[PDB]
Short mmCIF file of N, CA and C in Angstrom, two decimals:
data_model
loop_
_atom_site.label_atom_id
_atom_site.label_comp_id
_atom_site.label_asym_id
_atom_site.label_seq_id
_atom_site.Cartn_x
_atom_site.Cartn_y
_atom_site.Cartn_z
N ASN A 13 17.80 -43.36 -49.07
CA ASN A 13 17.65 -44.63 -47.95
C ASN A 13 16.62 -45.14 -47.15
N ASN A 14 16.88 -45.65 -46.06
CA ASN A 14 15.19 -45.47 -45.63
C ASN A 14 15.80 -44.96 -44.22
N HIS A 15 17.22 -43.64 -44.48
CA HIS A 15 17.44 -42.61 -43.49
C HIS A 15 17.03 -41.30 -43.64
N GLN A 16 17.21 -41.32 -45.24
CA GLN A 16 17.02 -39.64 -45.84
C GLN A 16 15.90 -38.90 -45.63
N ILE A 17 15.22 -39.59 -44.89
CA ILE A 17 13.96 -38.53 -44.34
C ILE A 17 14.07 -38.54 -43.09
N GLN A 18 14.36 -39.17 -42.36
CA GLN A 18 14.28 -39.07 -40.78
C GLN A 18 15.60 -38.21 -40.44
N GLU A 19 16.67 -37.88 -41.53
CA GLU A 19 17.51 -36.93 -41.13
C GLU A 19 17.33 -35.68 -41.69
N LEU A 20 16.22 -35.30 -42.20
CA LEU A 20 15.56 -33.75 -42.32
C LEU A 20 14.82 -33.48 -41.05
N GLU A 21 14.24 -34.51 -40.36
CA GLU A 21 13.39 -34.43 -39.36
C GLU A 21 13.61 -34.39 -38.24
N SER A 22 15.08 -34.85 -38.07
CA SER A 22 16.01 -34.39 -36.56
C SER A 22 17.23 -33.14 -36.74
N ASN A 23 17.16 -32.94 -38.38
CA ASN A 23 17.88 -31.47 -38.73
C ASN A 23 17.03 -30.18 -38.15
N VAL A 24 15.90 -30.22 -39.40
CA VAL A 24 14.90 -29.18 -39.00
C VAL A 24 14.37 -28.77 -37.38
N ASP A 25 13.97 -30.31 -37.16
CA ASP A 25 13.88 -30.08 -35.16
C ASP A 25 14.88 -29.05 -34.79
N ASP A 26 16.34 -29.49 -34.86
CA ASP A 26 17.48 -28.96 -34.53
C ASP A 26 17.67 -27.07 -34.72
N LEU A 27 17.14 -26.92 -36.22
CA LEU A 27 17.17 -25.90 -36.56
C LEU A 27 16.12 -25.03 -36.04
N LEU A 28 15.28 -25.02 -36.09
CA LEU A 28 13.93 -24.48 -35.36
C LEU A 28 14.20 -24.11 -33.58
N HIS A 29 14.71 -25.17 -33.37
CA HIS A 29 15.25 -25.40 -31.59
C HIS A 29 15.62 -24.76 -31.09
N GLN A 30 17.27 -24.09 -32.09
CA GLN A 30 18.40 -23.00 -32.26
C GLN A 30 17.27 -21.75 -32.43
N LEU A 31 16.95 -21.92 -33.36
CA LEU A 31 16.09 -20.03 -33.89
C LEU A 31 15.13 -19.60 -32.65
N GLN A 32 14.51 -20.72 -31.86
CA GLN A 32 13.73 -20.50 -30.48
C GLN A 32 14.87 -19.84 -29.81
N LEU A 33 15.89 -20.13 -29.36
CA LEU A 33 17.11 -20.19 -28.31
C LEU A 33 17.34 -18.44 -28.79
N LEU A 34 17.41 -18.59 -29.84
CA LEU A 34 18.18 -17.36 -30.47
C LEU A 34 17.39 -15.37 -30.47
N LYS A 35 15.84 -16.53 -30.59
CA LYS A 35 14.77 -15.33 -30.80
C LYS A 35 14.73 -14.63 -29.73
N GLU A 36 14.99 -15.66 -28.47
CA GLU A 36 15.19 -15.56 -27.16
C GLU A 36 16.54 -14.88 -26.32
N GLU A 37 17.70 -14.83 -26.79
CA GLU A 37 18.79 -14.37 -26.18
C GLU A 37 18.18 -12.92 -26.98
N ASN A 38 18.06 -13.01 -28.54
CA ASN A 38 17.96 -11.72 -29.16
C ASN A 38 16.98 -10.99 -28.24
N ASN A 39 15.55 -11.43 -27.43
CA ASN A 39 14.62 -9.98 -26.80
C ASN A 39 15.38 -10.33 -25.66
N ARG A 40 16.30 -10.79 -24.43
CA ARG A 40 17.11 -10.95 -23.34
C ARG A 40 18.13 -10.07 -23.14
N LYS A 41 18.57 -9.95 -24.57
CA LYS A 41 19.38 -9.06 -24.88
C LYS A 41 19.06 -7.39 -25.23
N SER A 42 17.96 -7.26 -25.93
CA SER A 42 17.16 -6.16 -26.53
C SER A 42 16.69 -5.51 -25.12
N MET A 43 16.42 -6.00 -24.26
CA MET A 43 15.69 -5.38 -22.62
C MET A 43 17.02 -4.80 -22.18
N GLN A 44 17.92 -5.63 -22.15
CA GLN A 44 19.57 -5.52 -21.05
C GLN A 44 19.63 -4.10 -21.75
N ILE A 45 20.18 -4.05 -22.77
CA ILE A 45 20.13 -2.67 -23.50
C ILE A 45 19.31 -1.62 -23.17
N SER A 46 18.13 -1.77 -22.72
CA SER A 46 17.28 -1.04 -22.62
C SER A 46 17.63 -0.33 -21.21
N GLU A 47 18.13 -1.39 -20.69
CA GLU A 47 18.15 -0.70 -19.21
C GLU A 47 19.28 -0.43 -18.84
N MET A 48 20.32 -1.07 -19.66
CA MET A 48 21.60 -0.19 -19.32
C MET A 48 22.09 1.15 -19.95
N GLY A 49 20.78 1.23 -21.29
CA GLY A 49 21.04 2.73 -22.22
C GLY A 49 20.28 4.00 -21.04
N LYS A 50 19.36 3.35 -19.91
CA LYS A 50 18.50 4.36 -18.70
C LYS A 50 19.68 4.54 -17.72
N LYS A 51 20.49 3.21 -16.89
CA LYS A 51 21.32 3.71 -16.27
C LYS A 51 22.47 4.33 -16.21
N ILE A 52 22.70 4.67 -17.62
CA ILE A 52 23.88 5.50 -18.40
C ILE A 52 23.45 6.85 -18.30
N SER A 53 22.14 7.40 -19.35
CA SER A 53 21.36 8.35 -19.31
C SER A 53 21.34 8.94 -17.56
N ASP A 54 20.82 7.91 -16.77
CA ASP A 54 21.16 8.37 -15.36
C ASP A 54 21.87 8.52 -14.59
N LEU A 55 23.33 8.26 -14.72
CA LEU A 55 24.91 8.13 -14.01
C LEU A 55 24.98 9.15 -14.83
N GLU A 56 24.84 9.67 -15.97
CA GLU A 56 25.54 11.10 -17.04
C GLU A 56 24.85 12.22 -15.84
N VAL A 57 23.68 12.29 -15.91
CA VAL A 57 22.89 13.50 -15.30
C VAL A 57 23.26 13.46 -14.06
N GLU A 58 23.57 12.66 -13.49
CA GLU A 58 23.94 12.26 -11.70
C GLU A 58 24.91 13.03 -11.56
N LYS A 59 26.81 12.16 -12.19
CA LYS A 59 28.08 12.98 -12.71
C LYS A 59 27.79 14.87 -12.61
N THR A 60 26.85 14.85 -13.86
CA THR A 60 26.44 16.22 -13.81
C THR A 60 25.85 17.38 -12.69
N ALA A 61 25.53 16.64 -12.56
CA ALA A 61 25.00 16.98 -10.79
C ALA A 61 26.01 17.70 -9.47
N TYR A 62 26.97 16.40 -9.79
CA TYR A 62 28.08 16.05 -8.48
C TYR A 62 29.24 17.54 -8.63
N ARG A 63 29.02 17.48 -10.23
CA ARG A 63 30.21 18.33 -11.32
C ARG A 63 30.28 19.56 -10.95
N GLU A 64 28.98 20.08 -11.75
CA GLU A 64 28.49 21.25 -11.04
C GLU A 64 28.52 21.84 -9.65
N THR A 65 27.94 21.37 -8.86
CA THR A 65 27.77 21.77 -7.47
C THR A 65 29.46 21.62 -6.83
N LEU A 66 30.25 21.32 -6.85
CA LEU A 66 31.48 20.58 -6.69
C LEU A 66 32.27 22.53 -7.45
N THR A 67 31.97 22.59 -8.64
CA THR A 67 32.77 23.96 -9.35
C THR A 67 31.96 24.84 -8.54
N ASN A 68 30.77 25.14 -8.17
CA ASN A 68 30.37 26.39 -7.82
C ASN A 68 30.88 26.25 -6.30
N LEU A 69 30.85 25.52 -5.83
CA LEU A 69 30.97 25.12 -4.01
C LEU A 69 32.91 25.92 -4.18
N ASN A 70 33.59 25.26 -5.07
CA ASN A 70 35.10 25.31 -5.47
C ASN A 70 35.00 26.99 -5.24
N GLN A 71 34.60 27.95 -5.93
CA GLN A 71 34.70 29.38 -6.12
C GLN A 71 34.04 29.99 -5.30
N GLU A 72 33.54 29.30 -4.17
CA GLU A 72 33.20 30.23 -3.01
C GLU A 72 34.07 30.00 -1.95
N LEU A 73 34.57 29.06 -2.50
CA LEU A 73 35.81 28.38 -1.43
C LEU A 73 37.29 29.17 -1.15
N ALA A 74 37.37 29.28 -2.73
CA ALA A 74 38.42 30.36 -3.58
C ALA A 74 38.08 31.71 -2.71
N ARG A 75 36.65 31.95 -3.00
CA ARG A 75 36.42 33.83 -2.79
C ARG A 75 36.46 33.86 -0.79
N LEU A 76 35.94 32.95 -0.28
CA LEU A 76 36.14 32.86 1.32
C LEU A 76 38.08 32.61 1.60
N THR A 77 38.11 32.09 0.90
CA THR A 77 39.56 31.58 1.85
C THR A 77 40.79 32.93 1.18
N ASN A 78 40.86 33.40 0.53
CA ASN A 78 41.09 34.69 0.07
C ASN A 78 40.99 35.84 0.63
N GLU A 79 39.58 36.03 1.55
CA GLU A 79 39.13 36.83 2.41
C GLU A 79 39.79 36.61 3.23
N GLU A 80 39.66 35.35 4.07
CA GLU A 80 40.11 35.13 5.25
C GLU A 80 41.52 35.35 5.52
N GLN A 81 42.05 35.27 4.34
CA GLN A 81 43.80 35.19 3.98
C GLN A 81 44.02 36.71 4.47
N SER A 82 43.29 37.93 3.73
CA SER A 82 43.57 39.39 3.31
C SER A 82 43.42 39.69 4.46
N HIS A 83 42.39 39.53 4.98
CA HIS A 83 41.57 39.64 6.67
C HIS A 83 42.95 39.65 7.83
N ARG A 84 43.02 38.36 7.55
CA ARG A 84 44.17 37.11 8.51
C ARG A 84 45.44 38.66 8.18
N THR A 85 45.60 39.23 7.18
CA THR A 85 47.42 39.66 6.53
C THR A 85 47.34 40.93 7.15
N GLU A 86 45.92 41.38 7.06
CA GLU A 86 45.36 42.98 8.01
C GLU A 86 45.96 42.98 8.86
N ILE A 87 45.33 41.96 9.53
CA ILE A 87 45.30 42.15 11.41
C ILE A 87 46.48 42.24 11.92
N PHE A 88 47.35 41.56 11.43
CA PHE A 88 48.74 41.56 11.49
C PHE A 88 49.75 42.34 11.05
N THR A 89 49.57 43.28 10.07
CA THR A 89 50.16 44.61 9.94
C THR A 89 49.49 45.29 10.57
N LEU A 90 48.58 45.47 10.78
CA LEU A 90 48.58 46.87 12.29
C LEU A 90 48.84 46.21 13.47
N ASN A 91 49.01 44.98 14.32
CA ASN A 91 49.33 44.68 15.43
C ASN A 91 50.16 44.74 15.53
N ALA A 92 51.58 44.54 14.75
CA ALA A 92 52.94 44.99 14.40
C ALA A 92 53.22 46.78 14.70
N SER A 93 52.52 47.20 13.42
CA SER A 93 52.31 48.72 13.31
C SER A 93 51.91 49.50 15.01
N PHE A 94 51.21 48.67 15.55
CA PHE A 94 50.36 49.03 17.11
C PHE A 94 51.86 49.05 18.09
N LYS A 95 52.73 47.62 18.34
CA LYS A 95 53.98 47.66 19.26
C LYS A 95 55.05 48.50 18.97
N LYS A 96 55.01 48.80 17.51
CA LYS A 96 56.08 49.68 17.18
C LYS A 96 55.64 51.09 17.04
N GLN A 97 54.66 51.77 17.26
CA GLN A 97 54.42 53.00 18.16
C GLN A 97 54.66 53.05 19.46
N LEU A 98 54.16 51.64 19.94
CA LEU A 98 54.24 51.44 21.40
C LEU A 98 55.55 50.87 21.83
N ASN B 17 3.36 -33.89 -54.76
CA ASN B 17 3.30 -33.20 -55.90
C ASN B 17 4.49 -32.58 -56.70
N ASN B 18 4.27 -31.88 -57.39
CA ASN B 18 5.52 -31.34 -58.29
C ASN B 18 6.58 -30.18 -57.66
N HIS B 19 5.91 -29.75 -56.41
CA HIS B 19 5.97 -28.40 -56.33
C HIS B 19 6.41 -28.93 -54.47
N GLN B 20 6.78 -29.88 -54.61
CA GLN B 20 7.05 -30.76 -52.90
C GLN B 20 7.86 -30.61 -52.24
N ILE B 21 9.44 -30.77 -53.36
CA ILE B 21 10.20 -30.62 -53.43
C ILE B 21 11.63 -29.30 -52.96
N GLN B 22 10.08 -28.37 -54.18
CA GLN B 22 10.73 -26.97 -54.70
C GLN B 22 10.45 -26.34 -52.83
N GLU B 23 9.42 -26.82 -52.06
CA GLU B 23 8.48 -25.69 -50.98
C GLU B 23 9.77 -25.96 -49.88
N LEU B 24 10.06 -27.08 -49.43
CA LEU B 24 11.88 -26.89 -48.77
C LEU B 24 12.70 -26.21 -48.86
N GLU B 25 13.35 -26.64 -49.90
CA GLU B 25 14.06 -25.74 -50.64
C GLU B 25 14.51 -24.33 -49.93
N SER B 26 12.79 -23.77 -50.32
CA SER B 26 13.48 -22.32 -50.40
C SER B 26 12.80 -22.18 -48.85
N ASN B 27 12.11 -23.27 -48.10
CA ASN B 27 12.19 -22.73 -46.49
C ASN B 27 13.13 -23.02 -45.96
N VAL B 28 13.95 -23.91 -45.86
CA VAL B 28 14.90 -24.56 -45.27
C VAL B 28 16.47 -22.95 -45.97
N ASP B 29 16.49 -22.22 -47.10
CA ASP B 29 16.64 -21.51 -47.92
C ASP B 29 16.34 -19.76 -46.51
N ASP B 30 15.24 -20.09 -46.10
CA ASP B 30 14.50 -18.59 -45.43
C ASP B 30 15.33 -19.30 -44.07
N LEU B 31 14.70 -19.91 -43.61
CA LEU B 31 15.51 -20.86 -41.63
C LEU B 31 16.53 -20.36 -41.62
N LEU B 32 17.81 -20.94 -42.84
CA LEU B 32 19.50 -20.77 -42.91
C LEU B 32 19.43 -19.37 -42.60
N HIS B 33 18.71 -18.34 -43.78
CA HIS B 33 19.06 -16.86 -44.33
C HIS B 33 18.68 -16.30 -42.77
N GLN B 34 17.63 -16.40 -41.61
CA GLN B 34 16.89 -15.67 -40.31
C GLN B 34 18.01 -16.11 -39.24
N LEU B 35 18.29 -17.44 -39.75
CA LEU B 35 19.43 -17.90 -38.28
C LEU B 35 20.83 -17.16 -38.49
N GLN B 36 21.09 -16.75 -39.77
CA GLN B 36 22.04 -15.93 -40.38
C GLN B 36 21.95 -14.39 -39.76
N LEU B 37 21.04 -13.97 -40.09
CA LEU B 37 20.58 -12.47 -39.26
C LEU B 37 20.45 -12.71 -38.20
N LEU B 38 20.47 -13.57 -37.40
CA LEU B 38 20.05 -13.96 -35.65
C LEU B 38 21.39 -13.93 -35.47
N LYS B 39 22.45 -14.39 -35.52
CA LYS B 39 23.53 -14.84 -35.19
C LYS B 39 24.15 -13.93 -35.01
N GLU B 40 24.08 -12.76 -36.45
CA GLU B 40 24.80 -11.66 -36.33
C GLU B 40 24.76 -10.33 -35.54
N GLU B 41 22.98 -10.59 -35.40
CA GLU B 41 22.25 -9.50 -34.23
C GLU B 41 22.94 -10.05 -33.08
N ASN B 42 22.71 -11.02 -32.34
CA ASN B 42 23.12 -11.47 -31.09
C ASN B 42 24.72 -11.10 -31.07
N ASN B 43 25.41 -10.83 -32.32
CA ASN B 43 26.81 -10.62 -31.65
C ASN B 43 27.07 -8.95 -31.80
N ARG B 44 26.67 -8.31 -32.66
CA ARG B 44 25.99 -7.07 -32.79
C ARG B 44 26.04 -6.55 -31.04
N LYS B 45 24.12 -7.27 -30.50
CA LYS B 45 24.21 -6.72 -29.08
C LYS B 45 25.06 -7.18 -28.28
N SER B 46 25.48 -8.40 -28.53
CA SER B 46 26.86 -8.79 -27.00
C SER B 46 27.85 -7.85 -27.14
N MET B 47 28.54 -7.55 -27.86
CA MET B 47 29.61 -6.32 -28.02
C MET B 47 29.19 -4.74 -27.64
N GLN B 48 28.17 -4.68 -28.07
CA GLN B 48 27.10 -3.27 -27.54
C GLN B 48 26.56 -3.17 -26.05
N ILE B 49 26.39 -4.87 -25.77
CA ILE B 49 26.59 -4.46 -24.10
C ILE B 49 27.72 -4.63 -23.02
N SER B 50 29.06 -5.21 -23.38
CA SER B 50 30.37 -5.05 -23.39
C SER B 50 30.63 -3.51 -23.15
N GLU B 51 30.26 -2.73 -24.05
CA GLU B 51 30.86 -1.11 -24.25
C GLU B 51 29.79 -0.75 -23.29
N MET B 52 28.70 -1.11 -22.85
CA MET B 52 27.80 0.06 -22.21
C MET B 52 28.14 -0.65 -20.83
N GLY B 53 28.24 -2.05 -20.59
CA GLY B 53 29.12 -2.47 -19.37
C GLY B 53 30.13 -0.98 -18.44
N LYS B 54 30.91 -1.54 -19.63
CA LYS B 54 32.44 -0.10 -19.34
C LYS B 54 31.52 1.32 -19.08
N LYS B 55 31.24 1.57 -19.92
CA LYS B 55 30.48 2.96 -20.02
C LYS B 55 29.98 3.31 -18.41
N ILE B 56 29.12 2.21 -18.10
CA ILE B 56 28.27 2.69 -16.86
C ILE B 56 29.98 2.20 -15.49
N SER B 57 30.81 1.31 -15.74
CA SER B 57 31.61 1.11 -14.89
C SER B 57 32.33 2.51 -14.31
N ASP B 58 32.87 3.61 -15.48
CA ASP B 58 33.62 4.34 -15.98
C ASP B 58 32.68 5.38 -15.40
N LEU B 59 31.25 5.66 -15.58
CA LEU B 59 30.04 7.26 -15.04
C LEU B 59 30.12 6.68 -13.19
N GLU B 60 30.10 5.55 -13.28
CA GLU B 60 30.25 4.94 -11.32
C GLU B 60 30.80 5.64 -10.95
N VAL B 61 32.27 5.46 -10.97
CA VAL B 61 33.60 5.66 -10.67
C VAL B 61 33.83 7.42 -10.94
N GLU B 62 33.59 8.15 -11.60
CA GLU B 62 34.07 9.60 -12.32
C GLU B 62 32.63 10.32 -11.00
N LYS B 63 31.41 9.50 -10.66
CA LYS B 63 30.83 9.71 -10.29
C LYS B 63 31.34 10.22 -8.82
N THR B 64 31.73 9.18 -8.14
CA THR B 64 31.82 9.10 -6.91
C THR B 64 33.52 10.02 -6.92
N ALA B 65 33.88 9.93 -8.13
CA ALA B 65 35.15 11.28 -8.04
C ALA B 65 34.78 12.63 -7.32
N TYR B 66 33.37 12.97 -7.82
CA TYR B 66 32.83 14.26 -7.56
C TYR B 66 32.59 14.31 -6.62
N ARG B 67 31.58 13.16 -6.41
CA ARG B 67 30.81 12.94 -5.14
C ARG B 67 31.97 13.13 -3.79
N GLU B 68 32.73 12.69 -3.82
CA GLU B 68 33.76 12.60 -2.72
C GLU B 68 34.51 13.75 -2.32
N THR B 69 34.71 13.90 -3.81
CA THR B 69 35.35 15.87 -3.56
C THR B 69 34.69 17.08 -2.98
N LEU B 70 33.07 16.98 -3.34
CA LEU B 70 32.15 17.49 -3.97
C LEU B 70 31.77 17.79 -1.55
N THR B 71 31.80 16.36 -0.91
CA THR B 71 31.32 16.11 0.27
C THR B 71 32.60 16.98 1.03
N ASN B 72 34.02 16.77 0.86
CA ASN B 72 35.24 16.62 1.34
C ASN B 72 35.23 18.55 1.57
N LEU B 73 34.87 19.22 -0.06
CA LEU B 73 34.59 20.44 -0.03
C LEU B 73 33.92 21.15 0.73
N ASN B 74 32.78 20.68 0.70
CA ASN B 74 32.06 21.06 1.70
C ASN B 74 32.04 21.15 3.40
N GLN B 75 32.63 20.17 3.42
CA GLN B 75 32.98 20.28 5.24
C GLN B 75 33.88 21.39 5.22
N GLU B 76 35.25 21.95 4.66
CA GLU B 76 36.15 23.21 4.63
C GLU B 76 35.08 24.34 4.36
N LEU B 77 34.47 24.20 3.24
CA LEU B 77 33.02 25.50 3.45
C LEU B 77 32.97 25.67 4.48
N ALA B 78 32.41 24.72 5.38
CA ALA B 78 30.91 24.93 6.59
C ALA B 78 32.59 25.65 7.59
N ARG B 79 33.93 25.21 7.56
CA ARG B 79 34.80 25.43 8.68
C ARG B 79 34.98 26.55 8.23
N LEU B 80 35.80 27.02 6.87
CA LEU B 80 36.23 28.41 6.90
C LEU B 80 34.81 29.32 7.42
N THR B 81 33.72 29.43 6.96
CA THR B 81 32.50 30.34 7.20
C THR B 81 32.23 30.36 8.26
N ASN B 82 31.77 28.71 9.24
CA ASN B 82 32.22 29.12 10.59
C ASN B 82 32.55 30.03 11.51
N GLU B 83 34.18 29.86 10.93
CA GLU B 83 35.72 30.87 11.47
C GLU B 83 35.21 32.73 10.91
N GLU B 84 35.07 33.01 9.73
CA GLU B 84 34.74 33.65 9.27
C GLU B 84 33.57 34.58 9.90
N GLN B 85 32.29 33.75 10.38
CA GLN B 85 31.14 34.53 10.77
C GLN B 85 31.56 34.85 12.65
N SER B 86 32.57 33.89 13.40
CA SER B 86 32.29 34.03 14.76
C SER B 86 33.76 35.37 15.13
N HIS B 87 34.39 35.59 13.64
CA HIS B 87 35.32 36.68 13.55
C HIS B 87 35.23 38.25 13.26
N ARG B 88 33.82 37.79 12.73
CA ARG B 88 33.02 39.10 12.05
C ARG B 88 32.14 39.59 13.44
N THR B 89 31.94 38.63 13.86
CA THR B 89 30.57 38.82 15.30
C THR B 89 31.87 39.73 15.93
N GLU B 90 32.62 38.96 17.02
CA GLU B 90 33.98 39.31 17.67
C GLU B 90 34.50 40.41 17.36
N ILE B 91 34.97 40.90 16.09
CA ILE B 91 35.73 42.32 15.79
C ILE B 91 34.49 43.22 15.95
N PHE B 92 33.06 43.46 15.75
CA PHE B 92 31.62 43.93 15.94
C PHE B 92 31.33 43.90 17.16
N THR B 93 31.51 43.02 17.88
CA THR B 93 31.89 43.72 19.50
C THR B 93 32.33 44.27 20.45
N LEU B 94 33.71 43.86 20.22
CA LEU B 94 34.76 44.89 20.34
C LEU B 94 34.73 46.20 19.55
N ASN B 95 34.06 46.44 18.52
CA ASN B 95 34.36 47.78 17.93
C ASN B 95 33.62 48.60 18.36
N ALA B 96 32.10 47.96 19.11
CA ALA B 96 30.97 48.58 19.71
C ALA B 96 31.48 49.09 21.55
N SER B 97 31.86 48.31 21.65
CA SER B 97 32.73 48.06 22.97
C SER B 97 33.91 48.82 23.43
N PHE B 98 34.31 49.58 22.01
CA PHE B 98 35.27 50.58 21.97
C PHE B 98 34.98 52.03 22.29
N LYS B 99 33.61 52.31 21.97
CA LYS B 99 32.68 53.79 21.38
C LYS B 99 32.01 53.72 23.07
N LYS B 100 32.08 52.43 23.58
CA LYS B 100 31.06 52.74 24.55
C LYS B 100 31.91 53.12 25.80
N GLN B 101 32.97 52.78 25.44
CA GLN B 101 34.21 52.74 26.82
C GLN B 101 34.17 54.42 26.33
N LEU B 102 34.43 54.74 24.82
CA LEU B 102 34.85 56.24 24.63
C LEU B 102 33.47 56.96 23.86
#
């Protein structure tokens, strides 16, 4: 008819626009995925740094409190053993 | 010519295939972005949990070591002050 060519013109125009917009999206998404991949690696090693220091300091803390305790006990035993002789 | 219609047939076929493959990519990427967004939030709060415990235990550790030190000093001062009278 008198419309049959103008039909494809507009259609082709659309496909080629959409495929512009989508190649654009795919690009913005590839970039965001790169940046998020890096953020994940960074957070993972920062989490590991805090965890490993936490567990190391927990061990020292256990060690000290166990000492402060055995020392606190021994000084109470001697101080009662003092007044029982005196 | 005798080629001019078969030309668009194959072309249109391509655009419509590519736009299939790209709508597919955009979908796989939207999903991966969702999962990475969540992983980032999870790692951020796990990092915070380790950091806040680390800083709390560091304070207790400082407190103990300062005590164990003032106690260790005082018991050396008294023990030298002992043998100087005796």
